[PDB]
Write a protein that binds this ligand. Structure first.
Ligand SMILES: Nc1nc2c(ncn2[C@@H]2O[C@H](COP(=O)(O)OP(=O)(O)OP(=O)(O)O)[C@@H](O)[C@H]2O)c(=O)[nH]1
Ligand SMILES: [Mg+2]
Lengths: 215, 78, 818, 64, 463, 56
């Protein structure tokens, strides 16, 4: 019936790399900070066009005090990105408005170009802990070199297993893959949807173009 | 198990301990060793002669305890 | 749910097995996910914030979790949002809680809000325990070596200890792995462990060896010799990794590496050694899920955090002695303070309301509070005391019956009949009576208890937004909405000006935006207009006035000669922190001032008041030969003058704002003898004028609030961050790489007005890599002079720095002062 | 084994001194330590835990 | 007891019938009226707009809107001994049963501060050009004696630190103060402003007073009656004092006792068939009885009236003469009908169907509705007196909403009987005028209240 | 005027007429002092005319 596949990771990682050119650069979701459906609903609702996003037909359809210029302090001028980001502060008469704004711990993805020895002794960044203080945090635990005989026949549980395995790197890589390749067993799907062009669709500001592409 | 989980689970709670010689000790157990030896604080001991002996701290041996009275409401088991 | 309720009631009754726990950690360090996982363990019954992905409001959870001993424990957990703007909820949580648990991300290291949370905890005298979340990041993201990981772990703990030592003069406690204060846990993969916890696991797997002794020598500069057997201080030249590494990090890496790395070839055998039993189905899962399951089976329930909480938490019994002095205005002495300390359900009992939790359906909301003494029964009528209410001020106070009591699991409401003191509880029916923080008291009882000090806020609210409903006729509805948000948020401060503009003061953009949104969709139906964000300002005078204007009252019974000059470099900051506060004795205070700042003894003697706030920037001083000659009358006149001076300082003589960093000094006092009601009534209005005049005479003062900004960013985008800051008038303080992680930290300052939209611009230019948090930190004089007629302001075009002061002054006045 | 059939049942425990304990059997151990609920001595002990060293006989005094 | 600042009090600048907010903070909490400028300020303490105002605007005597107390500042003390009984009474008028009988005044010509001279209950109201409908219902309900006397002397209701026997919520406390106000014999001006009551009834969701696109005397009367009965109610003082005698839509619900009795009637409809098919009876409780009004052409132009139809107006008299039930049971819907008024309530509201808002703006049903009944002997009495022409019960006209046809909205003026001078009294946007009771019907009637006498033969005999 | 027509809301201008024909900077500014004066003046004039003869 050819539904329900289960993948060997080695197979999956090999396929992924062959599809690597097609694959998007960035593992985290912070890149698409402004790539928000809520933003798009609000933009249409607020009739505001995001620099390089889609435009739309207008959804439906005067001296005032707050407008006055002499009472206005300007340090920075309220750019449209703010109006879309905070549309009930930036923008008046919001209706049916959702809360964009995703804040999360920074997403860091590690990959190594050359296999070397499984695992990495030091990070690419090479930030140094350089612990610095007094007597390197003196520890007064179990009476060392005295009554600490220890226990015979006991050992660390994970000592027998290797810290890294030939497929460890590949296993880790599959944690940050586009949706069909991050699951060993993933549901079978039809070709009805069409294409994998959305990553291409997701491009923000390519440059070196005619408008043709902006449309 | 019931002796272990309720033993160390009674730490800090009032409980009654009846020795093998008839010495009843009621108080808050500080800790319960895996050897069943326990230590109680502010425990009242009542001898066979009716003498009530209030002790600040008492350590009862595991083999010297005939039974123990656990608190009413707790779940080690149903 | 009834059986659980009975058990919960017994636990609550004990009051020693339940410890209130509050945890605060920098944005996204995992507090929320940890709580969610804990709830799942506790109740397998799995039935704006969610979409945003950022906690906007603090949530309280109560659960019972068995420890290693197995004795049941009652935990009240309040989760506080990581974001700095929404720090106010965290402050409320800290005040309610006995102890606070700190969460630090392993990869991120020490972060802005971590420091602030630690400082607040030290100031509030709550015991601090720290859990390191996202432990796996080094292993599975950074791919640091186990030795390297241990080095990085030592660093974070050392930094935290240093901060604690800095904040408190007395080093009662230091956080270290050996102590058990710090728990290494990763929320996502369900592994929470402490050296004690790990030792217990080892003991369970192995023969019976004593866990405590092994744990003590387990972590920090201890080397275990296999031949040696028992742990000993390092003596091998050959080099065996510190025993923390050898017994913990090594096996942790090996478990992770097998599961991600292999999972088919050798993963099963590793499991056999471990003794874990796996279904074929389970072994077909994706790696993250499979890894989490494996880790859960290996690490037990979630024991380390519970152990830490039971062990180093003072709980209800200790509770009040540290807490009441800060919290209760009496501070104990004769009755109420003593009663609170016992914590028994007897006599006065007591409640403290530090929060209001909104109901979707209606404006009324259920209040959350920590019952301090005695106990509360449903349907009892309880007196409510406002922050405003003091000793004999009955008019503010209101009394209403209690409709219902609830014990809160995450966003589930357990009704209960009664609640003993020392337990968090939601109170139905007290919503209308209480504004912001509140105290609940015996109703109609003689009792008499001073209200707990109102929340004191780590930040100062600065950003001002004007609000007006689109349709004028809907005004009262909007006003109602505003009331609701004042209850919902802690620091959120509203006001109505002379113009009539309705004003909201907030901490920053995200805070303000969320408040606006919440009001618009949940409190008031009406469409709301909004003005562009503007900062408040503060007024200070650069130099002393050569000539001092002396003004008589309506009836010329007296005259007042007063000068003004800017206070010393380290005066105002100390005055506010209460270091040299008015509470201290004249001899003590004067002497302290003189020693610290080389103050004159005579001038010290002459100090009368700190103006606008009991702790306030401004100082009032009396230095006249004449005053000494006829002091009797002088004291009374000084008191009235001080009240007038206080009024003058808050309002301002330019933008109608607060006056900052200014000393006002009386040189001549003229009061007609036996002035009676003349002096009493006329002097106050006069004094306000006098202050202003000296202010006019004593130079021009320029002010604007500044924000401290932490930017986390990759090396390649540092130039872009610098450029944005330069564009907005910022200036950078420090640019330094983060140890043990790849990334730079940029610390900078930036003018409040120029900060609007800064975050967004930074993120946009760096392609979502840099990220900025921003917090009010510092006042600083504006370049432009307060008064400059020769300066012409163009109506739209941004002005040059040389005369921003003029622009700000004029426009602010036009907004309201006129 | 046979310990699963007597779970959540009211048994009758006899000690070495001749004292009988009638209560609901809850949990036991490999050392034959009986934890009885609502036990009544032949004074109401209620919740109590009896050691297996002094145990003698365990009989069923009624339906569970 | 000259607290000398009492001299500074300006009675003539007070007006309690304004929204209860600080004018320079728009908070409701702890509002204090300055008695010298009549402006509201939130208060007591140092940095409070009331204290600051007392000193920058030299105005020391204040009144605590939400607590019945006066304060003299700058010290901040309470004026224990309060000759401001006058002032407190214009906040919060207070009555004892003697007063409601007392003079037989019935409505003795009061003075305001201006010496304008007006009959107590018989007062008009500001801004009729946005709340005229509301003012018509308020004056109807505050005329009905059991309802009115209940509110006027039920001083218990909703203080701060009241006992337990007393509370009902903000809606009822405010409608109580409106009623108190409109009977006040010592009003500082002749007329009152219910605009804040009305806006609080739209803005304060516990009333969704959220009716619009019609918004009449009928609709608002119904919405008020229903609300009062839900919001004073049984044991919760709102159905014992309401008066489940004073009407009785005797069918169902007995609610707040006074307005399920005290405004409902019961029409037992009685469907019939011939043969032996005993078709069925439907008692229905009803607070207001919708008259029809025969077949006015409406989509037909005019010179109207005497040159299309006025005179015989009276397709209408006691129109039904039993409604569907006695003579002209032209009961189109089904086999047989008669519609008996089988409970007959101590008042009886009629509401003339004047028109079908289902279609366009409305050509109404103008067909004049002649019951200026003139009949007592001792007559020229407008003796109203409607007697049941199958049974006897005998009822006297005592109110009469009029529609007027302003080129801008509508308008809705309200004509009340005054038993004791025997003088009908129009009010018409703060204006008042006496009207010849035989000429009442020459306006477009809209709503009448009809008191039951001969029940005052049960209570002519029951005194 | 305030005594004759006093409103808590001070909606007044809500209905206040102005000229849409001119640009915002040219069109009349809205102020309570200005708007209350406007309504007070209109009110004063309106009260000098009997409804039975004419009205405004
Ligand atoms: N590496 C790692 N990341 C985690 C773990 N648990 C949670 N996270 C991530 O950390 C981010 C924040 O976690 P949350 O618990 O949602 O944050 P929170 O504290 O609940 O909400 P804030 O208080 O606003 O931060 C999320 O993106 C999680 O995916 C973990 O065990 N390891
Ligand atoms: Mg959270």
């Amino acid at each position: 019936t050819y539904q329900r596949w289960q993948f060997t990771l080695p197979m999956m990682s090999t396929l992924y790399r062959l599809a690597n050119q097609l694959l998007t650069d960035l593992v985290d979701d912070n890149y698409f900070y402004l790539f928000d459906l809520k933003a798009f609903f609000t933009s249409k609702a607020l009739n505001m066009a995001i620099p390089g996003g889609p435009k739309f037909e207008p959804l439906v359809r005067d001296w005032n005090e707050f407008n006055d210029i002499n009472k206005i302090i300007i340090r920075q001028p309220i750019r449209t990105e703010y109006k879309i980001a905070f549309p009930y502060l930036y923008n008046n008469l919001p209706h049916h408005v959702h809360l964009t704004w995703y804040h999360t711990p920074n997403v860091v993805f590690i990959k190594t170009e050359d296999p070397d020895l499984p695992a990495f002794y030091f990070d690419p960044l090479i930030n140094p802990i350089s612990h610095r203080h007094s007597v390197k945090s003196q520890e007064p635990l179990p009476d060392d070199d005295e009554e600490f005989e220890l226990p015979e026949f006991v050992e660390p549980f994970l000592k027998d297993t290797p810290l890294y395995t030939d497929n460890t790197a590949n296993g880790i890589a599959l944690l940050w893959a586009p949706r069909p390749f991050n699951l060993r067993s993933g549901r079978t799907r039809r070709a009805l949807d069409i294409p994998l062009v959305k990553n291409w669709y997701r491009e923000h500001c390519p440059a070196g173009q005619p408008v043709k592409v902006r449309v | 198990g019931v002796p272990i989980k309720v033993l160390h689970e009674a730490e800090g709670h009032i409980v009654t301990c009846e020795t093998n010689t008839g010495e009843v000790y009621r108080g808050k157990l500080i800790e319960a060793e895996d050897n069943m030896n326990c230590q109680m604080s502010n425990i009242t001991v009542t001898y066979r002669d009716g003498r009530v002996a209030q002790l600040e701290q008492v350590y009862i041996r595991g083999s010297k305890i005939r039974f123990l009275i656990l608190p009413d409401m707790l779940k080690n088991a149903p | 749910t009834v059986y659980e309720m009975d058990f919960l009631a017994d636990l609550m009754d004990n009051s020693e097995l339940i410890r209130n726990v509050t945890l605060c950690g920098h944005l996204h360090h995992g507090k929320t996910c940890f709580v969610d996982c804990l709830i799942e363990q506790t109740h397998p019954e799995i039935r704006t914030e969610q979409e945003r992905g950022v906690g906007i409001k603090s949530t309280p959870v109560t659960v019972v979790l068995p420890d290693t001993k197995g004795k049941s424990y009652l935990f009240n957990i309040m989760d506080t949002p990581g974001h700095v703007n929404f720090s106010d909820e965290v402050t409320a949580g800290l005040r309610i809680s006995d102890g606070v648990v700190l969460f630090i991300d392993a990869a991120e290291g020490v972060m802005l809000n971590t420091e602030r949370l630690i400082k607040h905890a030290v100031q509030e005298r709550l015991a601090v325990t720290v859990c390191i979340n996202k432990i796996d990041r080094l292993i599975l993201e950074l791919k640091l070596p186990p030795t390297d990981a241990y080095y990085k772990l030592r660093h974070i703990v050392d930094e935290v200890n240093g901060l604690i030592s800095m904040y408190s003069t007395d080093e009662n406690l230091i956080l270290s792995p050996l102590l058990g204060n710090v728990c290494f846990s990763s929320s996502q993969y369900s592994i929470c462990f402490t050296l004690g916890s790990f030792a217990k696991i080892y003991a369970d797997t192995f023969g019976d060896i004593n866990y405590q002794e092994f744990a003590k020598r387990l972590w920090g500069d201890i080397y275990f010799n296999p031949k040696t057997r028992k742990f000993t201080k390092k003596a091998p030249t050959s080099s065996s990794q510190r025993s923390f590494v050898e017994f913990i990090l090594e096996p942790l890496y090996k478990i992770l590496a097998q599961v991600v790395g292999d999972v088919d070839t050798s993963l099963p055998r590793t499991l056999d050694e471990l003794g874990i039993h796996l279904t074929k189905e389970e072994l077909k899962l994706n790696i993250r899920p499979l890894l989490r399951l494996v880790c859960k089976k290996f690490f037990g329930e979630f024991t380390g955090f519970v152990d830490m909480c039971v062990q180093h938490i003072p709980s209800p019994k200790v509770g009040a002695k540290p807490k009441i002095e800060h919290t209760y205005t009496g501070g104990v002495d004769s009755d109420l303070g003593e009663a609170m300390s016992d914590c028994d359900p007897d006599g006065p009992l007591m409640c403290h309301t530090t929060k209001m939790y909104s109901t979707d359906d209606g404006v009324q909301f259920h209040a959350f509070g920590r019952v301090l003494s005695g106990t509360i029964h449903a349907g009892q009528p309880v007196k409510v005391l406002g922050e405003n209410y003091t000793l004999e001020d009955e008019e503010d106070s209101q009394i209403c019956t209690v409709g219902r009591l609830w014990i809160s699991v995450a966003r589930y409401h357990i009704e209960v009949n009664r609640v003993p003191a020392g337990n968090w509880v939601l109170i139905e029916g007290v919503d209308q009576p209480i504004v912001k923080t509140a105290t609940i008291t015996e109703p109609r009882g003689n009792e008499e208890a001073q209200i707990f000090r109102p929340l004191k806020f780590n930040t100062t609210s600065v950003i001002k937004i004007a609000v007006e409903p689109v349709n004028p006729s809907e005004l009262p509805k909007m006003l109602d909405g505003l009331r609701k948000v004042n209850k919902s948020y802690p620091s959120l401060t509203t006001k109505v000006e002379e113009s009539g503009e309705h004003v909201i003061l907030g901490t920053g953009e995200l805070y303000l935006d969320c408040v606006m949104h919440d009001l618009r969709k949940m409190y008031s139906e009406i469409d709301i207009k909004v003005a562009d964000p503007v900062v408040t300002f503060c007024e200070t005078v650069v130099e002393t006035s050569s000539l001092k204007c002396f003004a008589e009252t309506p009836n010329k019974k007296n005259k007042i000669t007063m000068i003004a000059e800017p206070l010393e470099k380290g005066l105002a900051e100390d005055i506010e922190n209460e270091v040299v506060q008015i509470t201290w004795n004249r001899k003590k205070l004067g002497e302290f001032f003189q020693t610290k700042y080389d103050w004159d003894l005579l001038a010290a003697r002459s100090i009368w008041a700190f103006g606008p706030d009991a702790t306030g920037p401004n100082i009032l001083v009396d230095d006249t030969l004449p005053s000494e000659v006829d002091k009797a009358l002088l004291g009374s006149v000084k008191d009235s003058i001080v009240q007038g001076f206080q009024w003058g300082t808050r309002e301002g003589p330019l933008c109608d704002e607060l006056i900052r960093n200014v000393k006002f000094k009386i040189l001549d006092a003229v009061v007609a003898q036996e002035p009676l009601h003349r002096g009493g009534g006329q002097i106050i209005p006069t004094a306000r004028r006098v202050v202003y005049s000296a202010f006019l005479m004593a130079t021009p003062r320029l002010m604007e609030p500044y924000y401290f900004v932490e930017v986390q960013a990759p090396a390649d985008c540092v130039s872009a961050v610098y450029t944005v800051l330069a564009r907005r008038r910022g200036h950078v303080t420090q640019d330094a790489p983060i140890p043990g992680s790849p990334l730079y930290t940029i610390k900078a300052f930036i003018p409040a007005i120029d900060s609007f939209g800064f975050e967004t611009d930074l993120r946009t230019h760096t392609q979502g890599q840099a990220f900025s948090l921003s917090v009010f930190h510092h006042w600083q004089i504006v370049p432009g002079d307060p008064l400059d007629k020769s300066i012409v302001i163009r109506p739209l075009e941004p002005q040059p720095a040389p005369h921003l002061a003029r622009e700000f002054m004029i426009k602010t006045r036009r907004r309201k002062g006129l | 084994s046979k310990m699963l059939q007597h779970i959540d049942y009211r048994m009758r425990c006899i000690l070495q001194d001749g004292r009988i304990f009638i209560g609901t059997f809850k949990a036991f151990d490999k050392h034959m330590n009986l934890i009885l609920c609502d036990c009544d001595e032949f004074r109401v002990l209620g919740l109590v835990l009896l050691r297996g060293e002094n145990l003698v006989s365990m009989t069923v005094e009624g339906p569970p | 007891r000259h607290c000398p600042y009492l001299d500074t009090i300006n009675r003539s600048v007070l007006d309690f019938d304004f929204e209860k907010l600080c004018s320079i903070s728009l908070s409701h909490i702890n509002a204090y009226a300055c008695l010298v400028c009549g402006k509201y300020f939130q208060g007591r303490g140092l940095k409070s707009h009331a204290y600051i105002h007392s000193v920058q605007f030299s105005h020391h005597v204040f009144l605590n809107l939400h607590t019945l107390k006066f304060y003299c500042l700058p010290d901040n003390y309470e004026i224990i001994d309060s000759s401001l009984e006058d002032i407190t009474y214009v906040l919060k008028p207070t009555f004892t049963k003697q007063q409601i009988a007392n003079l037989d005044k019935q409505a003795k010509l009061s003075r305001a501060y201006d010496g304008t001279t007006y009959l107590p209950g018989i007062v008009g109201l500001n801004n009729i050009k946005a709340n005229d409908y509301a003012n018509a219902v308020l004056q109807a309900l505050s005329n009905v004696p059991p309802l009115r006397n209940y509110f006027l002397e039920e001083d218990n209701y909703k203080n701060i630190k009241r006992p337990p026997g007393d509370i009902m919520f903000l809606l009822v406390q405010r409608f109580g103060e409106l009623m108190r106000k409109l009977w006040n014999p010592r009003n500082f001006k002749a007329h009152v402003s219910p605009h804040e009551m009305l806006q609080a009834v739209v803005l304060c969701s516990k009333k969704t007073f959220q009716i619009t696109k019609q918004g009449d005397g009928v609709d608002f009367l119904s919405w008020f009656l229903n609300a009062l009965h839900s919001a004073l109610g049984g044991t919760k003082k709102k159905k014992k004092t309401i008066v489940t005698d004073v009407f009785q839509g005797s069918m169902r619900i007995f609610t707040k006792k006074l307005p399920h009795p005290d405004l409902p009637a019961e029409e037992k409809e009685q469907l019939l068939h011939n043969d032996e098919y005993q078709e069925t009876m439907v008692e229905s409780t009803f607070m207001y009885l919708t008259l029809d009004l025969p077949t006015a052409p409406l989509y037909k132009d005019e010179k109207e009236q005497l040159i299309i139809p006025q005179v015989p107006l009276f397709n209408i008299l006691a129109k039904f003469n039993g409604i569907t039930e006695k003579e002209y049971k032209t009961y189109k819907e089904n086999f047989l009908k008669r519609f008996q008024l089988t409970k007959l309530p101590p008042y009886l509201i009629f509401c003339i169907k004047r028109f079908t808002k289902n279609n366009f703006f409305v050509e109404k049903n103008p067909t004049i509705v002649n019951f200026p009944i003139t009949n007592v002997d001792l007559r020229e009495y407008l003796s109203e007196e409607v007697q049941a022409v199958h049974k006897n019960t005998t009822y006297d006209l005592i109110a009469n909403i009029v529609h007027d046809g302003k080129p801008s909205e509508g308008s809705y003026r309200i004509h009340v009987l005054h038993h004791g001078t025997g003088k009908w009294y129009e009010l018409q946007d703060l204006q008042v005028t006496d009207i010849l009771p035989q000429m009442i019907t020459l306006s477009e009637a809209y709503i009448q209240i009809w008191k039951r006498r001969d029940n005052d033969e049960t209570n002519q005999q029951g005194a | 005027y305030l005594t004759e027509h006093p409103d808590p809301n001070n909606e007044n201008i809500v209905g206040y007429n102005n000229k849409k024909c001119w640009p915002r900077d040219a069109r009349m500014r809205l102020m309570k002092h200005d708007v209350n004066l406007g309504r007070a003046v209109f009110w004063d004039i309106k009260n000098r005319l009997p409804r039975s003869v004419t009205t405004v």
